[PDB]
Coordinates of C-alpha atoms in Angstrom, one line a residue:
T6 CA -53.4 -22.9 -44.5
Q7 CA -52.0 -26.1 -46.1
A8 CA -50.4 -23.9 -48.8
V9 CA -48.5 -21.7 -46.4
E10 CA -46.9 -24.8 -44.9
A11 CA -45.9 -26.0 -48.4
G12 CA -44.4 -22.5 -49.1
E13 CA -42.2 -22.9 -46.0
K14 CA -41.1 -26.4 -47.2
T15 CA -40.0 -24.8 -50.5
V16 CA -37.9 -22.2 -48.8
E17 CA -36.4 -24.9 -46.5
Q18 CA -35.3 -27.1 -49.4
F19 CA -34.0 -24.1 -51.3
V20 CA -31.7 -23.0 -48.5
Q21 CA -30.6 -26.6 -48.0
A22 CA -29.6 -27.0 -51.6
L23 CA -27.6 -23.8 -51.4
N24 CA -26.0 -25.0 -48.1
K25 CA -25.0 -28.3 -49.8
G26 CA -23.5 -26.5 -52.8
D27 CA -26.1 -28.1 -55.2
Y28 CA -26.9 -24.9 -57.0
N29 CA -28.6 -26.8 -59.9
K30 CA -31.0 -28.4 -57.5
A31 CA -31.8 -25.0 -56.0
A32 CA -32.2 -23.3 -59.4
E33 CA -34.8 -25.9 -60.4
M34 CA -37.0 -24.8 -57.5
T35 CA -37.5 -21.3 -59.1
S36 CA -40.3 -20.1 -61.3
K37 CA -40.1 -19.2 -65.0
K38 CA -37.9 -16.3 -66.2
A39 CA -40.2 -13.3 -66.4
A40 CA -41.1 -10.0 -64.7
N41 CA -42.6 -10.4 -61.3
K42 CA -41.3 -14.0 -61.4
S43 CA -37.7 -15.2 -61.7
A44 CA -35.0 -12.8 -62.9
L45 CA -32.8 -15.4 -64.6
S46 CA -33.1 -18.9 -66.2
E47 CA -32.1 -22.0 -64.3
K48 CA -28.7 -22.3 -66.0
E49 CA -28.0 -18.6 -65.2
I50 CA -28.9 -18.9 -61.6
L51 CA -26.6 -21.9 -61.4
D52 CA -23.6 -20.0 -62.8
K53 CA -24.3 -17.0 -60.5
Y54 CA -24.2 -18.9 -57.3
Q55 CA -21.3 -21.1 -58.4
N56 CA -19.3 -17.9 -59.3
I57 CA -20.2 -15.6 -56.4
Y58 CA -20.4 -18.2 -53.6
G59 CA -17.4 -19.9 -55.1
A60 CA -15.3 -16.7 -55.2
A61 CA -16.0 -16.0 -51.5
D62 CA -15.9 -19.7 -50.4
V63 CA -19.3 -19.6 -48.9
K64 CA -20.0 -22.5 -46.5
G65 CA -22.6 -23.4 -43.9
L66 CA -25.6 -21.3 -45.0
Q67 CA -28.3 -21.5 -42.3
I68 CA -31.4 -19.5 -41.6
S69 CA -33.8 -18.6 -38.8
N70 CA -36.9 -16.6 -38.1
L71 CA -38.6 -17.8 -41.2
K72 CA -41.9 -16.0 -42.0
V73 CA -44.1 -17.1 -44.9
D74 CA -47.5 -15.5 -45.5
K75 CA -49.7 -14.6 -48.4
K76 CA -49.8 -11.5 -50.6
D77 CA -52.2 -12.4 -53.5
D78 CA -54.2 -15.4 -54.7
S79 CA -51.0 -17.1 -56.1
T80 CA -48.2 -15.0 -54.5
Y81 CA -46.7 -15.8 -51.1
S82 CA -44.0 -13.5 -49.5
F83 CA -41.2 -15.0 -47.4
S84 CA -38.5 -13.6 -45.2
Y85 CA -35.8 -14.9 -42.9
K86 CA -32.6 -14.1 -41.1
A87 CA -29.5 -16.0 -42.3
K88 CA -25.8 -16.3 -41.7
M89 CA -22.9 -18.0 -43.5
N90 CA -19.2 -18.6 -43.3
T91 CA -16.9 -17.1 -46.0
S92 CA -13.1 -16.7 -46.5
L93 CA -13.2 -13.5 -44.4
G94 CA -15.3 -14.9 -41.5
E95 CA -18.9 -15.3 -40.6
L96 CA -21.5 -13.1 -42.5
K97 CA -24.1 -12.7 -39.7
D98 CA -27.4 -10.9 -39.6
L99 CA -28.6 -11.1 -43.2
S100 CA -32.2 -10.1 -44.0
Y101 CA -33.4 -12.1 -47.0
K102 CA -36.8 -11.4 -48.6
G103 CA -38.7 -12.7 -51.6
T104 CA -41.9 -14.0 -53.0
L105 CA -43.2 -17.4 -53.9
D106 CA -45.5 -18.5 -56.8
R107 CA -48.2 -21.2 -56.7
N108 CA -48.9 -22.6 -60.2
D109 CA -50.6 -26.0 -60.7
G110 CA -49.7 -28.2 -57.6
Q111 CA -46.2 -26.9 -56.9
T112 CA -44.7 -23.9 -55.2
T113 CA -41.5 -22.2 -56.6
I114 CA -39.3 -19.3 -55.7
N115 CA -39.6 -16.1 -57.7
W116 CA -35.8 -15.8 -57.8
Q117 CA -34.2 -12.4 -57.6
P118 CA -30.5 -11.5 -57.3
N119 CA -31.3 -10.3 -53.7
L120 CA -31.3 -14.1 -52.8
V121 CA -27.6 -14.3 -53.4
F122 CA -26.9 -11.3 -51.1
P123 CA -29.6 -9.1 -49.5
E124 CA -29.1 -5.8 -51.3
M125 CA -28.3 -7.0 -54.9
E126 CA -30.4 -5.7 -57.8
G127 CA -30.2 -6.3 -61.5
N128 CA -26.7 -7.0 -62.7
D129 CA -24.7 -6.1 -59.6
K130 CA -21.3 -7.7 -59.2
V131 CA -19.4 -9.1 -56.1
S132 CA -15.8 -8.2 -55.4
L133 CA -13.4 -10.0 -53.0
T134 CA -10.0 -8.5 -52.0
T135 CA -7.8 -10.4 -49.5
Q136 CA -4.5 -9.8 -47.8
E137 CA -2.5 -12.8 -46.6
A138 CA -1.6 -13.1 -42.9
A139 CA 2.0 -13.8 -42.0
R140 CA 2.4 -17.1 -40.1
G141 CA 3.6 -16.6 -36.5
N142 CA 6.9 -18.0 -35.3
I143 CA 7.7 -20.7 -32.8
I144 CA 10.5 -19.8 -30.3
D145 CA 12.2 -21.6 -27.5
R146 CA 12.4 -20.5 -23.8
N147 CA 15.1 -17.9 -24.8
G148 CA 13.6 -16.5 -28.0
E149 CA 15.7 -18.7 -30.3
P150 CA 13.7 -19.5 -33.4
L151 CA 12.3 -23.0 -33.9
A152 CA 10.0 -22.2 -36.9
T153 CA 10.2 -19.0 -38.8
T154 CA 8.8 -17.5 -42.0
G155 CA 11.1 -16.1 -44.7
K156 CA 11.5 -15.4 -48.3
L157 CA 13.5 -17.8 -50.5
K158 CA 14.9 -17.2 -54.0
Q159 CA 14.1 -20.0 -56.5
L160 CA 16.5 -20.3 -59.4
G161 CA 14.7 -21.7 -62.5
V162 CA 14.9 -22.0 -66.2
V163 CA 12.3 -21.6 -69.0
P164 CA 12.9 -24.3 -71.8
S165 CA 11.5 -22.0 -74.5
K166 CA 14.0 -19.2 -73.6
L167 CA 16.9 -21.7 -73.4
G168 CA 17.6 -22.1 -77.1
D169 CA 16.9 -24.3 -80.2
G170 CA 20.1 -26.1 -81.3
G171 CA 23.6 -25.5 -80.0
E172 CA 22.5 -22.3 -78.3
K173 CA 20.4 -24.5 -75.9
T174 CA 23.5 -26.6 -75.1
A175 CA 25.5 -23.5 -74.5
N176 CA 23.0 -21.9 -72.2
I177 CA 22.6 -25.1 -70.2
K178 CA 26.4 -25.2 -69.7
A179 CA 26.4 -21.5 -68.9
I180 CA 23.6 -21.8 -66.3
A181 CA 25.5 -24.8 -64.9
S182 CA 28.9 -23.0 -64.7
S183 CA 27.4 -20.2 -62.6
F184 CA 25.2 -21.9 -60.0
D185 CA 27.3 -25.0 -59.3
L186 CA 25.1 -27.7 -60.7
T187 CA 25.7 -30.7 -63.1
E188 CA 24.4 -30.2 -66.6
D189 CA 22.8 -33.6 -66.5
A190 CA 20.5 -32.7 -63.6
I191 CA 19.2 -29.6 -65.5
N192 CA 18.4 -31.8 -68.6
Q193 CA 16.7 -34.3 -66.3
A194 CA 14.5 -31.6 -64.8
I195 CA 13.6 -29.8 -68.0
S196 CA 12.7 -33.1 -69.7
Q197 CA 10.3 -34.5 -67.1
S198 CA 6.8 -35.7 -68.0
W199 CA 5.2 -32.5 -66.5
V200 CA 7.5 -29.9 -68.1
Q201 CA 6.0 -27.9 -71.1
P202 CA 8.0 -25.5 -73.3
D203 CA 6.8 -22.2 -71.7
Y204 CA 6.8 -23.5 -68.1
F205 CA 9.1 -22.7 -65.2
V206 CA 11.5 -25.4 -63.9
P207 CA 12.7 -24.8 -60.3
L208 CA 16.3 -25.8 -60.2
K209 CA 18.3 -24.6 -57.1
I210 CA 17.4 -22.6 -54.0
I211 CA 19.9 -19.7 -53.8
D212 CA 20.8 -18.8 -50.2
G213 CA 23.0 -15.8 -51.0
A214 CA 23.9 -13.3 -53.7
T215 CA 22.5 -13.8 -57.2
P216 CA 25.1 -14.1 -60.0
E217 CA 24.5 -13.1 -63.6
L218 CA 21.5 -14.8 -65.3
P219 CA 22.3 -16.6 -68.6
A220 CA 19.7 -16.8 -71.3
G221 CA 16.7 -18.8 -70.0
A222 CA 17.4 -18.6 -66.3
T223 CA 15.3 -16.5 -63.9
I224 CA 14.7 -16.1 -60.2
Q225 CA 11.3 -16.4 -58.5
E226 CA 11.0 -15.3 -54.9
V227 CA 8.7 -17.6 -52.8
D228 CA 7.5 -17.6 -49.2
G229 CA 9.3 -20.3 -47.2
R230 CA 8.9 -21.7 -43.7
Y231 CA 12.3 -22.5 -42.1
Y232 CA 13.3 -24.8 -39.3
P233 CA 16.7 -24.0 -37.8
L234 CA 17.1 -27.2 -35.8
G235 CA 16.0 -29.2 -38.8
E236 CA 15.6 -32.9 -38.0
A237 CA 16.6 -32.4 -34.3
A238 CA 13.1 -31.1 -33.6
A239 CA 11.1 -32.3 -36.7
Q240 CA 8.7 -34.5 -34.7
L241 CA 7.9 -31.9 -32.1
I242 CA 7.6 -28.8 -34.3
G243 CA 6.3 -30.5 -37.4
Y244 CA 6.0 -29.1 -40.9
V245 CA 3.6 -27.0 -43.0
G246 CA 2.3 -27.9 -46.5
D247 CA 0.5 -26.2 -49.3
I248 CA -3.2 -25.7 -48.7
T249 CA -5.4 -27.8 -51.0
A250 CA -8.9 -27.2 -52.3
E251 CA -10.1 -29.9 -49.9
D252 CA -8.6 -27.9 -46.9
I253 CA -10.7 -24.8 -47.9
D254 CA -13.8 -26.9 -48.1
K255 CA -13.4 -27.9 -44.4
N256 CA -12.3 -24.4 -43.3
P257 CA -13.0 -21.4 -45.6
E258 CA -11.0 -19.1 -43.3
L259 CA -7.8 -20.7 -44.5
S260 CA -5.8 -18.8 -47.1
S261 CA -5.9 -20.9 -50.3
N262 CA -2.6 -19.3 -51.2
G263 CA -0.8 -20.1 -48.0
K264 CA 0.5 -22.9 -45.7
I265 CA -1.2 -25.2 -43.3
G266 CA 0.3 -27.2 -40.4
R267 CA 0.4 -30.9 -41.3
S268 CA 1.9 -32.4 -38.1
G269 CA 3.5 -31.5 -34.8
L270 CA 3.0 -28.1 -33.2
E271 CA 2.5 -26.5 -36.6
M272 CA -0.8 -28.4 -36.8
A273 CA -1.6 -28.2 -33.1
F274 CA -1.3 -24.4 -33.0
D275 CA -2.3 -23.9 -36.7
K276 CA -5.2 -21.5 -35.8
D277 CA -3.0 -19.4 -33.5
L278 CA -0.1 -19.3 -36.0
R279 CA -2.0 -18.7 -39.3
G280 CA -3.6 -15.5 -38.1
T281 CA -6.7 -14.2 -39.9
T282 CA -7.1 -13.1 -43.5
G283 CA -7.7 -9.4 -44.0
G284 CA -9.8 -8.0 -46.8
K285 CA -13.1 -6.8 -48.0
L286 CA -16.2 -8.5 -49.5
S287 CA -18.3 -5.9 -51.3
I288 CA -21.2 -5.6 -53.7
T289 CA -20.5 -3.4 -56.8
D290 CA -22.7 -2.0 -59.6
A291 CA -22.9 -3.3 -63.1
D292 CA -19.6 -1.5 -64.0
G293 CA -17.7 -2.1 -60.8
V294 CA -18.5 0.9 -58.6
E295 CA -18.8 -0.1 -54.9
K296 CA -22.3 -0.2 -53.4
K297 CA -22.4 -2.0 -50.1
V298 CA -19.6 -3.7 -48.1
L299 CA -20.6 -7.0 -46.7
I300 CA -17.5 -7.9 -44.7
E301 CA -14.2 -6.1 -44.0
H302 CA -11.4 -7.0 -41.7
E303 CA -7.8 -5.9 -41.4
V304 CA -5.0 -8.5 -41.7
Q305 CA -4.0 -10.0 -38.3
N306 CA -0.6 -11.7 -38.4
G307 CA -0.3 -14.9 -36.4
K308 CA 0.9 -14.7 -32.8
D309 CA 4.2 -16.2 -31.8
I310 CA 4.3 -19.3 -29.6
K311 CA 7.0 -19.5 -26.9
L312 CA 7.9 -23.0 -25.7
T313 CA 9.7 -24.3 -22.6
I314 CA 12.1 -26.0 -25.0
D315 CA 15.8 -25.3 -24.8
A316 CA 17.1 -25.1 -28.3
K317 CA 20.7 -26.1 -27.3
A318 CA 19.3 -29.0 -25.2
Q319 CA 17.0 -30.1 -28.0
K320 CA 19.9 -30.3 -30.4
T321 CA 22.3 -32.1 -27.9
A322 CA 19.6 -34.6 -26.9
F323 CA 18.9 -35.4 -30.6
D324 CA 22.5 -35.6 -31.6
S325 CA 23.4 -37.9 -28.7
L326 CA 21.0 -40.5 -30.1
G327 CA 23.3 -40.8 -33.1
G328 CA 20.5 -41.6 -35.6
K329 CA 19.5 -44.7 -33.7
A330 CA 15.9 -45.4 -32.7
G331 CA 15.1 -43.8 -29.4
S332 CA 13.8 -40.8 -27.5
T333 CA 14.9 -38.3 -24.9
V334 CA 12.9 -36.0 -22.6
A335 CA 14.5 -33.4 -20.3
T336 CA 12.6 -31.5 -17.7
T337 CA 12.9 -29.1 -14.8
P338 CA 11.1 -31.5 -12.5
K339 CA 10.1 -28.8 -9.9
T340 CA 8.1 -26.8 -12.5
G341 CA 7.5 -29.3 -15.4
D342 CA 9.2 -27.3 -18.1
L343 CA 9.9 -29.6 -21.0
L344 CA 13.5 -28.7 -22.0
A345 CA 13.9 -31.2 -24.8
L346 CA 11.7 -33.6 -26.7
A347 CA 13.9 -35.5 -29.0
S348 CA 12.9 -38.5 -31.3
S349 CA 15.2 -40.4 -33.5
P350 CA 15.6 -41.3 -36.3
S351 CA 14.0 -38.1 -37.8
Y352 CA 13.1 -36.5 -41.1
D353 CA 14.1 -33.3 -42.8
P354 CA 11.2 -30.8 -42.2
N355 CA 12.8 -28.1 -44.4
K356 CA 13.0 -30.6 -47.3
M357 CA 9.5 -31.6 -46.3
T358 CA 7.9 -28.1 -46.4
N359 CA 9.8 -27.0 -49.5
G360 CA 10.5 -29.6 -52.3
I361 CA 10.3 -33.3 -51.4
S362 CA 10.5 -36.0 -54.0
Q363 CA 8.3 -39.1 -54.1
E364 CA 11.4 -41.3 -53.7
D365 CA 12.7 -39.5 -50.5
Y366 CA 9.3 -39.4 -49.0
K367 CA 8.9 -43.1 -49.5
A368 CA 12.3 -43.7 -47.9
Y369 CA 10.8 -42.1 -44.8
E370 CA 7.7 -44.2 -44.8
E371 CA 9.4 -47.5 -45.8
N372 CA 12.1 -47.0 -43.2
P373 CA 11.7 -49.8 -40.6
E374 CA 12.8 -47.5 -37.8
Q375 CA 10.0 -45.1 -38.8
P376 CA 11.4 -41.6 -38.5
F377 CA 7.8 -40.1 -38.5
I378 CA 7.0 -41.5 -35.1
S379 CA 7.0 -38.9 -32.2
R380 CA 8.7 -41.4 -29.8
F381 CA 8.4 -39.1 -26.8
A382 CA 4.6 -39.3 -27.1
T383 CA 4.4 -43.1 -27.9
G384 CA 3.4 -45.5 -25.1
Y385 CA 6.2 -47.9 -24.2
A386 CA 6.7 -50.4 -21.4
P387 CA 8.7 -48.3 -18.9
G388 CA 11.2 -51.1 -18.5
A389 CA 14.0 -51.0 -15.9
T390 CA 13.3 -47.5 -14.6
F391 CA 9.9 -48.5 -13.2
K392 CA 11.5 -50.4 -10.4
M393 CA 11.6 -47.2 -8.3
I394 CA 7.8 -46.7 -8.5
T395 CA 7.2 -50.3 -7.3
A396 CA 9.8 -49.8 -4.5
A397 CA 8.2 -46.5 -3.4
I398 CA 4.8 -48.2 -3.3
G399 CA 6.1 -51.1 -1.3
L400 CA 7.8 -48.8 1.2
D401 CA 4.5 -46.8 1.7
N402 CA 2.3 -49.8 2.4
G403 CA 5.0 -51.4 4.6
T404 CA 5.5 -54.4 2.3
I405 CA 9.1 -53.6 1.6
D406 CA 11.6 -53.5 4.4
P407 CA 14.7 -51.6 3.1
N408 CA 17.1 -53.7 5.1
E409 CA 15.4 -57.1 4.7
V410 CA 17.5 -59.4 2.5
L411 CA 16.0 -61.8 0.0
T412 CA 18.1 -64.9 -0.9
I413 CA 18.0 -65.3 -4.6
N414 CA 19.9 -68.1 -6.3
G415 CA 20.7 -67.8 -10.0
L416 CA 19.4 -65.7 -12.7
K417 CA 15.9 -67.2 -13.2
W418 CA 13.0 -67.5 -10.7
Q419 CA 9.4 -68.6 -10.8
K420 CA 6.8 -68.6 -8.0
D421 CA 5.8 -72.2 -8.5
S422 CA 5.5 -74.9 -11.2
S423 CA 2.2 -73.4 -12.4
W424 CA 4.2 -70.8 -14.3
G425 CA 5.4 -73.6 -16.5
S426 CA 8.6 -72.8 -18.5
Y427 CA 8.3 -69.0 -17.6
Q428 CA 10.7 -67.4 -15.2
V429 CA 11.6 -63.9 -14.2
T430 CA 15.2 -63.1 -15.3
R431 CA 17.8 -60.9 -13.7
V432 CA 21.3 -60.0 -15.1
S433 CA 23.5 -60.2 -11.9
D434 CA 23.7 -63.3 -9.8
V435 CA 23.8 -61.6 -6.4
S436 CA 22.9 -64.0 -3.5
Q437 CA 21.9 -61.6 -0.8
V438 CA 19.7 -58.8 -2.2
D439 CA 18.0 -56.0 -0.3
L440 CA 16.4 -52.9 -1.7
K441 CA 19.6 -50.9 -2.2
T442 CA 21.2 -53.9 -4.0
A443 CA 18.2 -54.4 -6.2
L444 CA 18.3 -50.8 -7.4
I445 CA 22.1 -50.9 -8.0
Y446 CA 22.0 -54.1 -10.0
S447 CA 18.5 -53.6 -11.4
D448 CA 17.3 -56.9 -10.0
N449 CA 14.0 -58.0 -11.6
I450 CA 13.6 -61.1 -9.4
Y451 CA 13.7 -59.1 -6.2
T452 CA 11.1 -56.7 -7.7
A453 CA 8.9 -59.5 -8.9
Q454 CA 9.0 -61.2 -5.5
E455 CA 8.2 -58.0 -3.6
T456 CA 5.3 -57.2 -6.1
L457 CA 3.8 -60.7 -5.5
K458 CA 4.1 -60.3 -1.7
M459 CA 2.5 -56.8 -1.9
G460 CA -0.4 -58.2 -4.0
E461 CA -2.4 -56.7 -6.8
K462 CA -4.7 -54.7 -4.5
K463 CA -2.0 -52.9 -2.7
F464 CA 0.0 -52.5 -5.9
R465 CA -2.9 -50.9 -7.8
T466 CA -3.7 -48.7 -4.8
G467 CA -0.2 -47.2 -5.1
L468 CA -0.3 -47.0 -8.9
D469 CA -3.7 -45.3 -8.9
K470 CA -2.2 -42.3 -7.1
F471 CA -0.3 -41.4 -10.3
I472 CA -1.5 -40.3 -13.8
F473 CA -2.7 -43.6 -15.3
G474 CA -5.7 -42.8 -17.5
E475 CA -5.2 -39.0 -17.4
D476 CA -5.1 -36.8 -20.4
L477 CA -2.1 -34.5 -20.0
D478 CA -2.8 -30.8 -20.8
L479 CA -0.3 -30.7 -23.6
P480 CA -0.6 -29.7 -27.3
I481 CA 0.8 -33.1 -28.3
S482 CA -1.3 -36.0 -29.5
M483 CA -0.9 -39.0 -27.1
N484 CA -2.9 -41.7 -25.4
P485 CA -3.1 -41.8 -21.6
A486 CA -0.8 -44.2 -19.8
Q487 CA -2.3 -47.6 -18.7
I488 CA -1.4 -50.1 -16.0
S489 CA -2.7 -53.0 -18.0
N490 CA -5.4 -53.8 -20.6
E491 CA -8.2 -54.4 -18.0
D492 CA -8.8 -53.2 -14.4
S493 CA -7.5 -56.6 -13.1
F494 CA -4.3 -58.5 -14.0
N495 CA -6.0 -61.9 -13.5
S496 CA -2.4 -63.3 -13.6
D497 CA 0.4 -63.6 -11.1
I498 CA 2.8 -63.6 -14.0
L499 CA 1.4 -60.3 -15.4
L500 CA 1.4 -58.8 -11.9
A501 CA 5.1 -59.8 -11.4
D502 CA 6.0 -58.6 -14.9
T503 CA 4.3 -55.2 -14.2
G504 CA 6.4 -54.9 -11.1
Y505 CA 9.7 -54.4 -12.9
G506 CA 8.2 -52.2 -15.7
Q507 CA 7.0 -54.7 -18.3
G508 CA 3.7 -56.6 -18.8
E509 CA 1.0 -54.5 -20.4
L510 CA 2.3 -51.2 -19.0
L511 CA 2.2 -48.4 -21.6
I512 CA 3.7 -45.1 -20.5
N513 CA 5.2 -42.6 -23.0
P514 CA 8.5 -40.8 -22.1
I515 CA 6.7 -37.6 -21.3
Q516 CA 4.3 -39.3 -18.9
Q517 CA 7.3 -41.1 -17.4
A518 CA 9.0 -37.7 -16.6
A519 CA 5.8 -36.7 -14.9
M520 CA 5.6 -39.8 -12.7
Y521 CA 9.3 -39.8 -11.9
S522 CA 9.1 -36.1 -10.8
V523 CA 7.9 -37.3 -7.4
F524 CA 11.6 -38.1 -6.5
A525 CA 12.4 -34.4 -7.1
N526 CA 9.5 -33.0 -5.1
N527 CA 9.3 -35.2 -2.0
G528 CA 6.4 -37.3 -3.4
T529 CA 4.6 -34.5 -5.3
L530 CA 4.0 -35.2 -8.9
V531 CA 4.5 -32.1 -11.1
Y532 CA 2.7 -32.1 -14.4
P533 CA 4.9 -31.4 -17.5
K534 CA 4.6 -28.1 -19.2
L535 CA 5.4 -27.1 -22.8
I536 CA 4.0 -23.6 -23.2
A537 CA 6.3 -21.1 -21.4
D538 CA 3.5 -18.8 -20.0
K539 CA 1.4 -21.6 -18.5
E540 CA 0.9 -22.1 -14.8
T541 CA 2.6 -25.0 -12.9
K542 CA 0.2 -27.7 -11.9
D543 CA 1.0 -30.5 -9.5
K544 CA -0.5 -33.5 -7.6
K545 CA 0.5 -33.9 -3.9
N546 CA 1.0 -37.0 -1.8
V547 CA 1.5 -39.4 -4.7
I548 CA 4.2 -41.3 -2.8
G549 CA 5.4 -40.8 0.8
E550 CA 8.3 -38.4 1.6
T551 CA 9.9 -41.3 3.5
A552 CA 10.0 -43.4 0.3
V553 CA 11.8 -40.6 -1.5
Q554 CA 14.4 -40.1 1.2
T555 CA 15.1 -43.8 1.1
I556 CA 15.2 -44.5 -2.6
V557 CA 17.1 -41.4 -3.8
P558 CA 20.3 -42.2 -1.8
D559 CA 20.1 -45.7 -3.4
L560 CA 19.8 -44.1 -6.8
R561 CA 23.0 -42.1 -6.1
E562 CA 24.6 -45.5 -5.6
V563 CA 23.4 -46.7 -9.0
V564 CA 26.0 -44.2 -10.3
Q565 CA 28.6 -44.2 -7.5
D566 CA 28.8 -48.0 -6.7
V567 CA 31.5 -49.8 -8.6
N568 CA 28.9 -52.4 -9.8
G569 CA 26.1 -49.9 -10.4
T570 CA 24.4 -50.1 -13.8
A571 CA 25.0 -46.4 -14.4
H572 CA 28.6 -46.3 -13.1
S573 CA 30.0 -44.8 -16.3
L574 CA 28.2 -41.6 -15.4
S575 CA 30.4 -41.2 -12.3
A576 CA 33.0 -39.9 -14.7
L577 CA 31.1 -36.6 -14.9
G578 CA 31.9 -35.7 -11.3
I579 CA 28.4 -34.2 -10.7
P580 CA 25.7 -35.2 -8.2
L581 CA 23.6 -37.8 -10.0
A582 CA 20.8 -40.1 -9.1
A583 CA 20.1 -42.6 -11.9
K584 CA 18.3 -45.8 -12.7
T585 CA 19.1 -47.7 -15.9
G586 CA 18.8 -51.1 -17.4
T587 CA 17.6 -53.2 -20.3
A588 CA 14.4 -55.1 -21.1
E589 CA 13.5 -57.6 -23.8
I590 CA 10.1 -56.6 -25.3
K591 CA 8.1 -58.5 -27.9
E592 CA 5.3 -56.6 -29.6
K593 CA 2.6 -58.1 -31.9
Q594 CA 4.5 -56.9 -35.0
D595 CA 7.7 -58.5 -33.8
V596 CA 8.6 -62.1 -34.5
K597 CA 11.2 -62.5 -31.8
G598 CA 12.1 -60.3 -28.8
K599 CA 14.0 -57.1 -29.2
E600 CA 16.0 -55.3 -26.5
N601 CA 15.4 -51.7 -25.3
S602 CA 17.7 -49.6 -23.2
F603 CA 16.4 -47.2 -20.5
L604 CA 17.8 -44.4 -18.5
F605 CA 16.5 -42.1 -15.8
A606 CA 18.6 -39.4 -14.2
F607 CA 18.3 -36.1 -12.2
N608 CA 20.3 -33.9 -9.9
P609 CA 19.5 -35.0 -6.3
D610 CA 21.2 -32.0 -4.8
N611 CA 19.2 -29.1 -6.4
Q612 CA 16.5 -30.9 -8.4
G613 CA 17.3 -28.6 -11.2
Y614 CA 16.9 -31.0 -14.1
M615 CA 15.5 -34.5 -14.9
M616 CA 16.1 -36.8 -17.8
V617 CA 14.5 -39.9 -19.3
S618 CA 16.1 -41.5 -22.3
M619 CA 15.4 -44.7 -24.2
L620 CA 16.8 -46.8 -27.1
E621 CA 14.3 -48.9 -29.0
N622 CA 15.5 -52.2 -30.6
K623 CA 19.1 -51.3 -29.6
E624 CA 22.2 -52.7 -31.3
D625 CA 24.5 -54.9 -29.2
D626 CA 26.8 -53.1 -26.7
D627 CA 24.7 -49.9 -27.2
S628 CA 22.7 -48.2 -24.4
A629 CA 21.1 -44.9 -23.4
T630 CA 23.6 -44.5 -20.6
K631 CA 26.6 -44.5 -23.0
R632 CA 25.0 -41.5 -24.8
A633 CA 23.8 -39.4 -21.9
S634 CA 26.9 -37.7 -20.5
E635 CA 26.9 -34.7 -22.9
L636 CA 23.3 -33.7 -22.2
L637 CA 23.8 -34.3 -18.5
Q638 CA 26.7 -31.8 -18.5
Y639 CA 24.7 -29.1 -20.2
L640 CA 21.6 -29.6 -18.0
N641 CA 23.8 -29.6 -14.8
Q642 CA 25.5 -26.4 -15.9
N643 CA 22.5 -24.4 -16.9
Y644 CA 19.7 -25.7 -14.7
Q645 CA 20.5 -25.6 -11.0

């Protein structure tokens, strides 16, 4: 029948309008208010859906098994299964039933309260009780807390309870001479544009015993997320913020009264950390007596997340950067455990998750050094450390003879006049350069020449055995490393520049620690790992074992040789293999070139730890090597 198909279309549009939250559009599809017709007027149906579905945060109403037949000459019965998402989960297996009316040339819904929820009759009410779930903690490899939930005491004043004249000036000075605060800051806070007489003005966060409360002052306990390392792990851990109405629209299972991860691991593991809201959604009678329970769950607190991070290493790595732009990554290269992921400069996550002013937040955004960047997950040109990879590749394909000596004159070199005014630059004017000398002095000209001899095809063959283009299995947002923009250099200059770690190479520090792990596993690349319980994954035969046993002794000389670039690290008296240097990088946003400092270091005796550190846009006479001794001591002492 052509009328049965039109009756289905009416039910389809009705469910759609309910799904899109347009309750007025769904109410206008109902018949007139009467017995055997619609139970309420259009405005009353609107307010019932907006109140009930709004109270439970109904979202994503969808139906199935729609059956529409005929019951009389103008009455058509319909039925369908349906499910929806609420603040307590998914309401599944709902049997909806009703009748349609065909008057004139339009079909409408004989609306009944059973179309809000299946077993609702007359003036039944809907009740929703919820219990908030406690956010899980984030802990280091030894159980030390990195992000914890706790209660905080908020000292505040009520301007109406403070006084009228004279008594107000006395109570302001009394509340100031008890909590250690200037009387001008209290008057500035209680006289802002938002403050009203009977409001509550949060003053100071008390972190101890509460003194006597003068007239007007009061304490308000509030739930507070706390970060013990503070800025030292702010980029990695992240921060949580107040949940907004827009967050609930995207995910109703969020607690509108709680916190949501805004960045870092708080956002990456937000679902595992937030838990699930417990409570009960029930239908009551006209007076509030419970009839049917729709949904009921117990509160499930969030599960803790245990990281491979070492809290003492994380703090030492971050402090060593001295507030300068840079990053540090420490690993146990044989297993991939990320011991430290430091990024500097940083922001205060405690100030961020509690009270942060518009001025201090803008100071973070307008800061040219950009403290919000997670530098350990930002792609950089690997710089001076990448010389080892090109060397290992050249040793495997037989291009590089370790004992063959190149004769290099001066500090600048170009292949031929086709390069124009461009030349590869080195820092030390050493005449007779072999592989060991090139690694000790960090000779870019030697590397550029050996890369050009090797050729693009052999160079890419060795590079393709690494992790370029791969998505690392890490809960950290990052782009995969790339060799260059396209699959071909189409440039001898770009090929040469790529050889010593520049050109269009983009590798973030974490991906660098993965690639450089081959020197601690005889050519096996061990993938980095951040979650403690995860299984170690690796990639075998990335470079030859011969290349490792040739390069690592040379990397010891980068430290031990009197002219090695990392010779200051020999003061430690510990077995070290390192590779350091400096590169001048010019990005699109930069006008002129800026200098970055690079460091790679690990223990060549036990392979217990590995470190990559970088300074971005460094000051003169500053370097990552000058700052690495303190972390290297800790890693060497506690990770053998």
